[PDB]
Amino acid sequence: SMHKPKLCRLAKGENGYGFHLNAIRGLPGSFIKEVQKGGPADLAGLEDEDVIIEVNGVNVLDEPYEKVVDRIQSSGKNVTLLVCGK
């Protein structure tokens, strides 16, 4: 929910960022699933079903899933996310 957004900065580990990005075909948006215990997403404060709003300050709400994946995969050693829960 945009009424309570969350900022999270992830430091990439040996297994990447330690989460799955999921999307539902036909519905807008991407969301966090399968946060790995003790991994970067966990330590950064991400929770299951968080929806990604911005990647490194870029609004991704209207971008296709494959583009959001590519932004995160291309970020380098860290990435900053604006997300919101529910």
Binding site: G16, Y17, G18, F19, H20, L21, N22, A23, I24, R25, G26, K33, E34, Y65, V69, I72, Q73
Partner: peptide, 8 residues
Amino acid sequence: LETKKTKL
């Protein structure tokens, strides 16, 4: 309900 998933 087709779900896309990517490990990151």
